[PDB]
Design a binder for this molecule. Structure first.
Ligand SMILES: [K+]
Ligand SMILES: [K+]
Ligand SMILES: [Mg+2]
Ligand SMILES: [Mg+2]
Ligand SMILES: [Mg+2]
Ligand SMILES: [Mg+2]
Ligand SMILES: [Mg+2]
Lengths: 266, 264, 264, 266
């Protein structure tokens, strides 16, 4: 196809910062660096004014000159129009360089660290269904590859949480070969099923919860991406079916996602 | 917890799509693209410079072309120094252009490695599959082999069948061998079509009738990067040749005759 | 195929050992180390400069200190230009110093990210394990929980036993549950000591006699980087408390009382 | 613990170059870049001499000056002592910059690409053994973590190749919890074993070969590193045993590898 309150576990402001460094959006990433870039120069520019006769030909003479020189020395561009006169000028200048490169290095580190973030995301049907299939009462939930990055050859595990014990639900099929389109995961509610004999009311009574999870590899980076979804009992629709998301035209069949989490009683 | 075919209807943000091409594109095209992006980036600042008169000291050649060739100076952090921001505004732009430039380099480099990271070892499959009498029973075979310079040995495989039923039921075809130790040469994967086989009793015509499809998939690790590379192939029913055999490539092996067969 | 305790007696090349510390070391120490490596690197070239007289034009302060502060100029590709290689030799050094410098930056950056790459999510185990009557039978339990900011949910675990036999036989203790869906809080891993259990009929004294040891291991993926992080823990027999229970941390949970127990 | 001739499969000189870029040793890596660095300037320096009056203050006047300016413009250091006079001077200069950065970028890419190479290596005993253990005739081979980087919690698969069919040999233990020391892998040669009833001579007759393979993760990078070893039939020693590689002193037991692949008949 084309197109709770933790208490006692030590947290560090450091790690939290990194977390946002990755969760944040691109535009916000740089703007943040900018606001961090300016701040970094302001700091050295001031550090320069401390000693008089800092940079030769410091223009515009004053703080603004010491600033626009900072940006020069920090990025290793070094025009040379300015030049450390006094020893102290150098001492600062030199220390500012070590900072600058480390500056670049860390940013670049983050920049790639962000690229590394897995790409292929997997959408689940906001609603799950229980419907008579091939004679017996089965349960189904469908998911499908959602980003440009493909996951084919994906395997899945389906669970149940209720009053709090955790039950495994045997899937009719555990792995899916050509996931590149969509997947309709389903679990038969026969004698062995932990769900056997459980009316919609019987679920609520025990605060039931359905947990699915699909793992698979991004064929493009080898990164093994996993994704997870949870349904509340009031999110399972009884005796419903998934609106078919796959038309056909000119002998060519396509698949419309526009109506992905939509259902219709049987 | 806190301390104390084709698809339609997809998202598809322009950003992500751009990155995708940044990786799918070929090397030459990668850089040329940057070039065309590099020029564009300077043109933009050069213009931004002309806005204020007396921008760069000794701006030669005096005019737009000078402001351009200065841009390339300030953006790459090379900074000859022949030019120099005179007016405050000159600096304001210059300084903002630097932050951009480095970020420029950083992103490119990020992409550059992001491309290196792409898994390397590719696995070719025989454009044609076969069903032939082997050791008494009617078995099915398809062969694949490591294709790039990067090796995959110790590779495991899963073989599937897709047909229409009463929906496209996906069946697991039991392979005679699931894993292959020394894959460094080639692999002849095969599935016996006995009583248990979902393919048992199915004439070539019987396949078409249900739009049958064979899906194989081989996973294994690139011993050189540890990257676990997977590859996949699909055969249509008219791509299975009946009562055929794979021409023995082979001490010399002629991978040219890889997907070639001969009736028994 | 071509087209057409402590250990002794180990290899341990100095290079690899250096890299190991490059990653084990703490951030502050990382840079300071580079600094001390940065200075050293210039001192070396500055001296290399003094060898030939009339090295850098306008070398200020005239003397070694000038040749130093020029080094830092030429090594970081900042190149103010106040100084300039006069003599040919000046250039020869200067040019060779540049190749070094960039390689300098490149390697550092390489390390810098190589450190970022280090898996983040860490998993703490209860310093003490317990054996207690649960649901009728004598079972054994140990609990662990996600410890860093980075989450591991959907984690699976393997539990082992090491004792001396007639060699240190390694036995697999069947866990009541092998995988845990929502690990985002905590996990209470437990193994029933019935007839099949290799621990069946073994008094606390019976353990020591054979130098018993409990080895657990939890694997799971950091949902944020896809990196599959594993963690491991070992208990000595005197670290198992008999007929005890884990103090319920818990809506608030006090992870401070994590490895605390109370007899039943 | 502390301390064949392929014919028809397309190869590209490109890919082959990268392969060496990673297989090569560090010193050789850079020297190679150097020799590649010089070459790169020589090329532009010449490209400069084509047009007269290339770089202002081109010292030493001549080719050597155009060279030492190249190194200036290529590394984005740009002293500024030299400066493109003629338009052509710039045209070259500008094109040389785009190259230079791409230069750095690719090198850095390689530099990290090398760091990424898995680290933890796993040594196998050059010799394997078949010895009476606990009554029955079993076969053993030992391996142990070899680099500074640890693999614990390692699993292994053992195979047999003979006249050419490939047999799986059931290991007494498939996975090893605390691999941080050493591992003695062993396969009982009872009725079910494909090796049952096979004298050392019986092996050779069919060109037997033993293939082991251990996979496990580097707890430090999450990289799942695998390693592989092969024994010829004349590399299996019969009725031998592995010299014990684990002494004890002061109540503290250590492990000497100095005698790792050494054996002694029973
Ligand atoms: K300069
Ligand atoms: K400069
Ligand atoms: Mg520079
Ligand atoms: Mg001036
Ligand atoms: Mg002039
Ligand atoms: Mg002066
Ligand atoms: Mg001069």
């Amino acid at each position: 196809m084309n197109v709770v309150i933790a208490y006692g576990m030590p947290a560090s402001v450091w790690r939290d910062l990194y977390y946002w460094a990755l969760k944040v959006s691109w535009p916000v990433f740089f703007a943040s660096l900018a606001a961090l870039f300016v701040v970094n120069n302001t700091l050295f520019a001031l550090l320069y004014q401390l000693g008089d006769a800092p940079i030769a030909n410091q223009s515009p003479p004053g703080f603004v000159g010491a600033f626009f020189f900072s940006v020069e020395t920090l990025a290793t561009v070094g025009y040379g129009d300015m030049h450390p006169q006094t020893v102290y000028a150098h001492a600062i200048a030199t220390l500012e360089i070590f900072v600058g490169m480390s500056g670049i290095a860390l940013s670049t580190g983050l920049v790639f660290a962000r690229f590394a973030r897995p790409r292929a995301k997997i959408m689940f049907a906001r609603h799950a269904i229980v419907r008579p299939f091939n004679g017996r009462m089965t349960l189904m939930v469908r998911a499908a590859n959602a980003r440009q990055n493909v996951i084919a050859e994906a395997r899945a595990k389906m669970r149940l949480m209720r009053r709090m014990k955790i039950h495994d639900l045997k899937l009719v099929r555990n792995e899916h070969p050509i996931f590149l389109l969509g997947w309709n995961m389903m679990h038969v509610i026969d004698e062995s099923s932990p769900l056997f004999g459980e009316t919609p009311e019987s679920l609520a009574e025990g605060r039931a919860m359905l947990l699915v999870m699909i793992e698979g590899s991004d064929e493009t980076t080898a990164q093994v991406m996993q994704a997870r979804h949870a349904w509340e009992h009031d999110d399972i629709r009884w005796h419903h079916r998934y609106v078919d998301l796959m038309s056909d035209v000119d002998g060519m069949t396509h698949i419309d996602y526009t109506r992905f989490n939509d259902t219709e009683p049987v």
